[PDB]
Structure 1
Amino acid sequence: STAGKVIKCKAAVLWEEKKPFSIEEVEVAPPKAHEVRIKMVATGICRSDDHVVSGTLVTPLPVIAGHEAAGIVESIGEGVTTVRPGDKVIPLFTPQCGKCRVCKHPEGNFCLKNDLSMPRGTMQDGTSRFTCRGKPIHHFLGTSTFSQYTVVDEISVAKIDAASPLEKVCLIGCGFSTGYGSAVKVAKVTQGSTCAVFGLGGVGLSVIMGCKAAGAARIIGVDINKDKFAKAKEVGATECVNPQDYKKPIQEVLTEMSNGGVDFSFEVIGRLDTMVTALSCCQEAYGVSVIVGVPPDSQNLSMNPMLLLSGRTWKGAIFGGFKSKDSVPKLVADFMAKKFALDPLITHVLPFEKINEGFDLLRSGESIRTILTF
């Protein structure tokens, strides 16, 4: 089977709060008006995900998790100009409604049309295309990438590159154009600079990964993890510090190295400490620091007004600060084009079904990124 009539399929239900994954069987309707059913091929275990499995990210339950994947279209409502079958795709966790103050503004990618602001679990009509054979499961962001078939609107879906290794191009979804993009469309990084990177996993190497893009020269990468450095220097890292080495604030052993501090820095750790700790190790005249990741489960952070006044910039961005329908694609190509490769992020490739020994290697450290193959 294939269709214009509900489908077979075994999506995985997240039956409520840090209870593993129910690798159930479900019933997805055919794509309503203006929507697009996609037959997945691959997905990643982003942590953003973990946060629902955990109370941390509030979003309605039951819900199909996953937002980081690469599909192959398979049905398309009436109204859809933008995609057509057999077409490869990247579901988009950030809309692209091509018009709302942010969509029509030159730095506005958080489309006034997402679920992040207030998770509703639905679909843009306030309705959900998924039954638990008997109960309506809710949606996630607008992807619910964790099923073998999903229904995403059109504002939330991007056509990648016809011979795009659907395997690899999944990453271009969170992990990698979030890291890499901070470095590139946000902290407008400059040729020359000294760039610091706080966190040496999946998103930071993607971030260390776009500096070098941005322009160049010095990309220190701090990780108190003697292991994350190979890979580190492996993807563009000019050097590697471990805050454990030294008997002084790292905020200091950095200001040294740059001679008053790295030009640009980035916390891809999401720690409430390391966040104040890098507004800090940047030049106070003109230095700029962007907050990448941020646990939904958090206290503010303690902080000195005084780090902003010397004249320094604190930014932040969702989805590498990139406007997405218009970008996932430029971005593949560049992968296609050669520009940047994706493997050192890919530490694990698995039969989708071990979603949970999957979400394991995630929790007990061990792996950078991992592709749950469908």
Structure 2
Amino acid sequence: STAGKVIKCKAAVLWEEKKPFSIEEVEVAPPKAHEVRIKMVATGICRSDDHVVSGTLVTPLPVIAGHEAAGIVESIGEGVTTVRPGDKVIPLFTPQCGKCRVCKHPEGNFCLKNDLSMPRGTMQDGTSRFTCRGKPIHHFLGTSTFSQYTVVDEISVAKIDAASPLEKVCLIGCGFSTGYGSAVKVAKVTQGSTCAVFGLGGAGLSVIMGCKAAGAARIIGVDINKDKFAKAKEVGATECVNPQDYKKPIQEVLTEMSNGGVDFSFEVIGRLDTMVTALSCCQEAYGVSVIVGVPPDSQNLSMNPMLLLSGRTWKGAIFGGFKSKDSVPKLVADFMAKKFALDPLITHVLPFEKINEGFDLLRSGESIRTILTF
């Protein structure tokens, strides 16, 4: 039995920025009240994890990163009512406390208990459950999935279908749900519309999936890497364009292609310039542009507010606008009912021990999602 005891297990520790993960033994404390300890089964490599490595995202180090995952509950602390030992679960990098003003709002999902805005890198109680080489190690987004075992707050975990294939549904923990929701929930793409999607990685492909599910007539994929185009078309893009192929700025190209601007545009990269381009390419009177990409820390963009005064709407969202704990189990159930596909996002499957090689596949442009298996 491990319940009530410290577990020594393997994890991928990031000691400093811009260095490889160190795969080594950590100690994982048992869960306190209202906490859940999870044996990880699969975790995805998301670009946002790479942002921690690259310094695009700032969070306290050293850290156990990872936020897109699925596993099995090993034990629960006093007072947990929503999961039990043996349950399949997905950690929620955006919590759902159910009590704050955001959780109570019909359209809000960025729960005030999140550790994204002003990261502390701890459990809700301000402490860590991880030690390595005698040193405390930070959590990441209340998830920390790059470990054989993690401990999360109850508000940061959802129970999912016992029959779920964890090596696929982990993607409901970030990339699929983010893109899909950004289209269907945040933008509210309409039937017959024209959409433009900037960035054709895992999140952008999931945006395309959502635009197609919503009935868009045209879905224009935009990427500087033309190797991304074939898979974009497979999941619903009607055309793809590479800005590098044109003498004009791509917002002008897209405005021309759409006979005056697109209905819906999405920035799914994380660059200030493409955020402004994406806004500009939507129709000036009624267009909507949604920011999904995470830009570099503390940098501001510049834009002309006449882009908004004419009638554009500009918004962003975390996790596709989904209330996390309510939504994740329903998304898994929908997947099990064949309502959407996940395989198109998965290009590589590697053992956890190959985490660094997985990050190299992402950085080279060669992968969409690598799933790591414990």
| TM-score when normalising by structure 1 | 0.97
Q: In the TM superposition, what is the alpha-carbon distance from 1:117 to its structure 2 partner? A: 1.1
Count of residues paired in the alignment: 374
What is the CA–CA distance in structure 2 between the aligned matches of 1:200 and 1:358, rounded to whole Å?
Answer: 18
Note the alpha carbon deviations across 1:9-39, whole angstroms, 9 max, x for none. Answer: 1112111222211111011111111111000
Tell me the CA shift for residue 77 of structure 1. 1.2
Q: Distance in 1 between matches of 2:205 and 2:288?
A: 19
Identity %: 100
Question: 1:344-372 CA distances to partner (integer Å, 9 max, x unpaired)?
Answer: 21111001011111211122221111111
- Aligned ranges for residues 67-146 of structure 1 at < 5 Å? 67-146=67-146
Aligned-residue offset at 1:130: 1.1
Aligned partners of 1:19 and 1:197: how far apart in 2? 31
* Structure 1 Cα separation of the partners of residues 244 and 50 of structure 2: 28
Q: CA deviation at 1:295?
A: 2.2
CA apart distance, 1:312:
0.6
Distance 1:38 1:47, change over 3 A: same
Which digits, 9 at most, give the CA deviation of each residue in 1:214-239, with x for residues without a partner? 23211121223322111111001122
Report Cα offsets for 1:44-66 as digits up to 9, x if no partner.
Answer: 11121122223332211211111
Residue 133 of structure 1 deviates from its aligned partner by 4.6
8 Å Cα contact 2:58/2:297 also seen in 1: no
Q: How many Å apart are 1:201 and its aligned residue? A: 1.3
- 1:298 shift after superposition: 5.3
State the alpha-carbon separation in 2 of the partners of residues 298 and 271 from structure 1: 12
Show CA shifts across 1:49-97 (max 9, x none).
1222233322112111111111111101121110012111111000100
CA deviations on 1:85-120 (whole Å, 9 max, x unpaired) are 211111100010001111101121110001111111
CA contact (8 A) 2:270 2:296 kept: no
Q: CA RMSD in A?
A: 1.3
Question: Which whole-Å CA distance do the structure 2 matches of 1:204 and 1:330 have between them?
Answer: 21
- Single out whichever of 356-365 and 198-207 deviates more from structure 2: 356-365
CA deviations over 1:242-276 (Å, ceiling 9, x no partner):
22333333212222222211100111121211111
Q: Please, which moves more after superposition, 313-322 or 127-136? A: 127-136
Distance in 2 between residues matched to 1:312 and 1:207, nearest whole Å? 20
| Counterpart residue number, 1:32 | 32
Provide the rounded CA distance (Å) in 1 between the counterparts of 2:343 and 2:311.
39
- In structure 1, the residue corresponding to 2:212 is in which secondary structure? helix
Conserved? CA contact 2:13–2:22, under 8 Å: yes
The answer to whether the Cα contact below 8 Å between 2:48 and 2:294 also exists between their aligned partners in 1 is: no
Going from structure 1 to structure 2, the CA distance change for 1:291 and 1:29 (only over 3 Å counts) comes to same
- Structure with more of its chain in helix, by fraction: 2
Structure 1 stretch 151-160 or stretch 4-13: which is displaced more? 4-13
Matched, 1:61 2:68: no
Structure 1 stretch 318-327 or stretch 8-17: which is displaced more? 8-17
**Distance in 1 between the 2:141 and 2:52 partners?**
12
C-alpha displacement of 1:299: 2.7
Q: Secondary structure at the match of 1:339?
A: coil
Distance 2:117 2:27 in 1: 28
Are the counterparts in 1 of residues 229 and 240 from structure 2 also a CA contact under 8 Å?
Answer: yes
* Distance in structure 2 (CA, Å) of the matches to 1:85 and 1:156: 16
- Greater shift after overlay, 240-249 or 265-274? 240-249
Distance in 1 (CA, whole Å) between partners of 2:50 and 2:201 is 16
Distance 2:363 2:95 in 1: 29
Gapped regions of structure 1 (runs ≥ 5):
none
CA contact (8 A) 2:41 2:373 kept: yes
Q: Distance in 2 between matches of 1:55 and 1:217?
A: 38
- Higher deviation after alignment, 64-73 or 255-264: 255-264
- Unaligned stretches of 5+ in structure 2? none
Aligned-partner SS, 1:296: coil
SS at match of 2:7: coil
d(CA) in 2 for partners of 1:286, 1:219: 17
Report the CA distance between 1:304 and its aligned residue.
1.1
Deviation for aligned residue 1:195? 0.8
* Shift of residue 8, structure 1, vs aligned partner: 2.7
Aligned mates of 1:212, 1:322 — CA distance in 2: 19
The worse-fitting range, judged by mean Cα deviation, of 98-107 and 221-230 is: 221-230
Give the alignment's TM-score, normalised by structure 2.
Answer: 0.97
Where do 1:192-211 residues align within 5 Å? 192-211=192-211
Answer yes or no: is the 8 Å Cα contact 2:180–2:320 preserved in 1: yes
Distance between the aligned counterparts of 1:20 and 1:251, measured in 2? 37
Q: For the Cα contact (< 8 Å) 2:271–2:296, is it kept in 1?
A: no
